[PDB]
Design a protein around this ligand. Structure first.
Ligand SMILES: C[C@H](CCC(=O)NCCC[N+](C)(C)C[C@H](O)CS(=O)(=O)O)[C@H]1CC[C@H]2[C@@H]3[C@H](O)C[C@@H]4C[C@H](O)CC[C@]4(C)[C@H]3C[C@H](O)[C@]12C
Ligand SMILES: C[C@H](CCC(=O)NCCC[N+](C)(C)C[C@H](O)CS(=O)(=O)O)[C@H]1CC[C@H]2[C@@H]3[C@H](O)C[C@@H]4C[C@H](O)CC[C@]4(C)[C@H]3C[C@H](O)[C@]12C
Ligand SMILES: C[C@H](CCC(=O)NCCC[N+](C)(C)C[C@H](O)CS(=O)(=O)O)[C@H]1CC[C@H]2[C@@H]3[C@H](O)C[C@@H]4C[C@H](O)CC[C@]4(C)[C@H]3C[C@H](O)[C@]12C
Ligand SMILES: C[C@H](CCC(=O)NCCC[N+](C)(C)C[C@H](O)CS(=O)(=O)O)[C@H]1CC[C@H]2[C@@H]3[C@H](O)C[C@@H]4C[C@H](O)CC[C@]4(C)[C@H]3C[C@H](O)[C@]12C
Ligand SMILES: C[C@H](CCC(=O)NCCC[N+](C)(C)C[C@H](O)CS(=O)(=O)O)[C@H]1CC[C@H]2[C@@H]3[C@H](O)C[C@@H]4C[C@H](O)CC[C@]4(C)[C@H]3C[C@H](O)[C@]12C
Ligand SMILES: C[S@@+](CC[C@H](N)C(=O)[O-])C[C@H]1O[C@@H](n2cnc3c(N)ncnc32)[C@H](O)[C@@H]1O
Ligand code: SF4
Ligand code: FES
Ligand SMILES: [Cl-]
Ligand SMILES: [Cl-]
Ligand SMILES: [S]
Ligand SMILES: [S]
Length: 346
């Protein structure tokens, strides 16, 4: 029964069978109950604060060739850009001036900055009294060590898919084993460590999604970023189907149920495939929002997938936009850095 699966989730009997059935049931009443459960767990464990992470996508140069990603190296159609270190620091300062308590630096895997330019930038942003999150992809342990020494607080490295065969096919420069070793290294170095997957990748099954949930639970990640796969026309996956919003939303809800004290963003991809998708996701277990703080003329060139929200908006629009969002949702903006606040339990 849908009823029995909810009871088992409520009782924290997180068996593969329970998770598979939750993901497989396509009953509206069940889905709405699951979303309510996640929303309640979110409210109880992490409260009504929605944490704002200002993201600066500072370079779209990439050395890797992931089949799903518009920044893949084989995409010749794309104008490549790099913000200067001074531009990045001053852009971060403007976000802090707008009230951002976390700055997220994200890029393609761009060799130019690695590792010392990143270290310099992180040190300057840390002087501003905010959290710094890096999302720069896979690099040697030494680089991650230098960045932690420089003051970085968190690292987002989505695991993408926990199916090693699918992972290797979609990410031909690397492997799930590498990705996992990176994530374990980040944990060992003391970063708040973020993982998470895409939903609806070509060839990905419900069993794969269950494996993603069990992977996340196993490693007790501090942040989990989940979103639908969105096909990009200048990639080998151009003609594949987009991920299903409702299924992806169920993954978010189950992640909250499994990791009740984690930080879980309402990802931009959720807002891209369905108008108002981020707001929905914030009401089904998410507690974090990541407004775009990349300046023009670069914002429109960071084309991981098409249709990406925020691209046509003014340079400073997105922090005010999410503050309005937070208020109309009956929520509150985060007061502190929004680090993970563990609730130890049984
Ligand atoms: C009560 C009100 C009259 C009708 C008119 C439009 C209806 C919504 C829309 O259909 C979209 C959506 C469809 C889903 O299936 C169930 C949820 C949603 C939000 C509906 C809820 C409800 O039924 C609405 C508000
Ligand atoms: C606004 C919308 C229509 C409400 C309505 O008109 N009836 C009445 O009272 C008198 S009268 O019938 O209107 O005359 C209702 C119908 C179903 C509702 C969602 C589901 O619960 C799942 C989920 C639960 C979470 O906790 C919060 C988020 C979610 C997405 C909900 C949001 C919202 O709440 C929805 C869309
Ligand atoms: C940057 C700019 C000049 C002054 C300045 O440099 N202040 C630095 C303030 C640093 N704080 C945020 C840490 C305090 C100041 C002047 C007016 C300020 C906005 C308004 O208040 C409304 C709103 C309040 C929210 O809460 C945060 C967002 C908003 C849009 C603000 C952003 C920013 O703050 C503005 C633009
Ligand atoms: C209107 C829009 C298409 C255009 C479709 C696409 C995805 C749909 C939502 C999701 O299914 C999740 C959720 C299921 C609940 O049962 C009813 C509420 C929710 C929020 C849905 C409302 C509505 O139906 C959406 C937004
Ligand atoms: C300037 C901009 C238009 C409006 C739209 C939404 C407004 C915020 C929300 O009201 C929530 C919150 C209420 C507090 O009272 C003061 C701070 C907050 C962050 C507001 C600041 C500012 O007023 C905002 C950004
Ligand atoms: C663009 S990468 C930038 C950071 C770093 N290069 C990395 O791969 O971790 C950020 C995230 O974008 C997501 N992404 C890339 N292409 C996508 C697509 N077509 N649809 C949805 N998400 C996508 C992936 O999950 C990835 O972890
Ligand atoms: S997902 Fe990250 S590593 Fe892969 S091509 Fe895109 S930017 Fe490069
Ligand atoms: S942050 Fe909401 S549209 Fe840009
Ligand atoms: Cl973060
Ligand atoms: Cl995203
Ligand atoms: S925005
Ligand atoms: S927004």
């Amino acid at each position: 029964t849908g009823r029995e699966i909810l009871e088992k989730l409520e009782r924290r009997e997180f068996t593969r069978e329970v998770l598979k059935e939750a993901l497989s049931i396509n009953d509206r009443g069940f889905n709405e109950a699951l979303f309510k459960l996640a929303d309640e767990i979110r409210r109880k464990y992490v409260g009504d604060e929605v944490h704002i992470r200002a993201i600066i996508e500072f370079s779209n140069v990439c050395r890797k060739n992931c089949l799903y990603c518009g920044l893949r190296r084989d995409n010749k159609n794309l104008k490549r850009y790099r913000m200067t270190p001074e531009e990045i620091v001053e852009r971060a300062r403007l976000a802090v001036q707008f009230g951002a308590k976390t700055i997220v630096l994200q890029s393609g895997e761009d060799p130019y900055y690695m590792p010392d330019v990143i270290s310099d930038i992180v040190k300057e942003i840390k002087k501003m009294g905010v959290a710094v999150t890096l999302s720069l992809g896979e690099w040697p342990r030494e680089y991650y060590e230098k960045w932690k020494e420089a003051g970085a607080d968190r690292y987002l490295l989505r695991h993408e898919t926990a199916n090693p065969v699918l992972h290797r096919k979609l990410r031909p420069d690397t492997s799930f084993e590498n990705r996992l070793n990176c994530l374990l290294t980040l944990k060992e170095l003391g970063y708040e460590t973020g993982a998470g997957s895409m939903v609806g990748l070509p060839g990905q099954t419900i069993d794969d999604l269950v494996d993603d949930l069990l992977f996340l639970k196993e490693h007790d990640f501090d942040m989990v970023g989940i979103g639908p796969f969105i096909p990009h026309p200048d990639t080998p996956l151009a003609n594949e189907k987009k991920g299903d919003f409702t299924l992806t939303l169920k993954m978010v809800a189950l992640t909250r149920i499994l990791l009740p004290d984690s930080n879980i963003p309402a990802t931009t991809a959720m807002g891209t495939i369905v108008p108002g998708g981020r707001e929905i996701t914030l009401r089904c277990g998410a507690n974090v929002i990541m407004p775009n703080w990349t300046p023009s003329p670069y914002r429109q060139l960071y084309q991981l997938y098409p249709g990406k929200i925020c691209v046509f908006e003014k340079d400073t629009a997105c922090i005010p936009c999410v503050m309005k969002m937070i208020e109309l949702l009956g929520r509150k903006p985060g007061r502190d850095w929004g680090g993970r606040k563990r609730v130890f339990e049984t």
